[PDB]
């Protein structure tokens, strides 16, 4: 059986907390490859399933993601409650994040004439800070995520006390051991999509794109551009414009994350400091978000 190494020590399937299948109840679906359910073990969980019709490589991928998530310990990375791998279909049990994924949340919670104050700049800055703290933890533990993006982040709840967390680690799992059209090229720096070079500064660039996602309130990056068009755009020095109403200090964090040379981009300690300074600036947090009519 395959092993996984993180933060010093090695782990195996035997290290995963196997939860008796009889102790697990599925409640409802929550919406690719394999289904997700709300469940109970009482402890409320999200249940990620492996389809019984799958390849041996699918099985190993599933095992590896379980090992990866179970080995993290940080408040801004989703918790793994355990697994149920000894019954079929196989389960991974995660912290239930009632707020759902960040991209969907931003789109469905955009300020509206019905909900004029559904969200403010400070809410967005807090989400950005949460994920940046998660990224800093990964960076200081030498883990490269490779796919930092709104679709891969979850929220504990829709309301004001919400906390954002990095939740999907499928790309990192694949590389740890696919095709061009499935690569998240719109979140990738030049050296990543050209040379296949990944470092912590890969995630910095991706975080810049996430920031754009956040302050655009859930738009797809590089509006109207295809993957190849973005590849050529970014390679030639092109960068996204500020999202609608985006404060200049926030846009500046994005453009620093998108420096062409990785050495010129900030690490996550610096990004955190700059996000913190934005949260302090009245001219930033007093800026009204656009109201979608
Ligand atoms: C694997 C799956 O896990 C969860 C999904 C959800 C989830 C998805 N959608 N919703 C909605 C349920 C109805 N109310 C709004 C949120 C909750 C909550 N916690 C989870 N651990 C998941 C999904 Cl589905 C999407 C992105 C992710 F990063 C992850 Cl990690």
Swiss-Prot record:
In the record, Phosphotyrosine modifications are located at 4, 37, 176
The outcome of changing residue 72 to I is:
In NBLST3; somatic mutation
Tissues in which the protein is found? Expressed in brain and CNS. Also expressed in the small intestine and testis, but not in normal lymphoid cells.
Effect listed in the UniProt record for changing residue 176 to S: In NBLST3; somatic mutation
Q: Where in the cell is it found?
A: Cell membrane
The UniProt record lists the Protein kinase domain at: 24-284
Q: How does it assemble?
A: Homodimer; homodimerizes following heparin- and ligand-binding. Interacts with CBL, IRS1, PIK3R1 and PLCG1. Interacts with FRS2 and SHC1. Interacts with PTN and MDK.
Q: Which protein, by its recorded name, is this?
A: ALK tyrosine kinase receptor
The encoding gene is: ALK
């Amino acid at each position: 059986n395959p092993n996984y190494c993180f933060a010093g020590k090695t782990s195996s399937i035997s290290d995963l907390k196997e939860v008796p299948r009889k102790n697990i109840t599925l409640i409802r679906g929550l919406g690719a490859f394999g289904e997700v359910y709300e469940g109970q073990v009482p402890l409320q969980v999200a249940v990620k399933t492996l389809p019984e019709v799958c390849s041996e490589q699918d099985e190993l991928d599933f095992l590896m993601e379980a090992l990866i998530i179970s080995k993290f310990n940080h408040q801004n990375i989703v918790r793994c409650i355990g697994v149920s791998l000894q019954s079929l279909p196989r389960f991974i049990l995660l912290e239930l994040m009632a707020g759902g994924d960040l991209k969907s949340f931003l789109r469905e919670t955009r300020p509206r004439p019905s909900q004029p104050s559904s969200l403010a700049m400070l809410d967005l800055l807090h989400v950005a800070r949460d994920i940046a703290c998660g990224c800093q933890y990964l960076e200081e533990n030498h883990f490269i995520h490779r796919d930092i993006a709104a679709r891969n982040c979850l929220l504990t709840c829709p309301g004001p006390g919400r906390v954002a967390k990095i939740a999907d680690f499928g790309m990192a799992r694949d590389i740890y051991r696919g095709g061009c059209a499935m690569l998240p090229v719109k979140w990738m720096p030049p050296e990543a999509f050209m040379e296949g070079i990944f470092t912590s500064k890969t995630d910095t660039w991706s975080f810049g794109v996430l920031l754009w996602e956040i302050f655009s309130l859930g738009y797809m990056p590089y509006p109207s551009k295809s993957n190849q068009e973005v590849l050529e755009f970014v390679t030639s020095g092109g960068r996204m414009d500020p999202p609608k109403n985006c404060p200049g200090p926030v846009y500046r964090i994005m453009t620093q994350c998108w420096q062409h040379q990785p050495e010129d981009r900030p690490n996550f300690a610096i990004i955190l400091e700059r996000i913190e300074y934005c949260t302090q600036d009245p001219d930033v947090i007093n800026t009204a978000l656009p109201i979608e009519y």
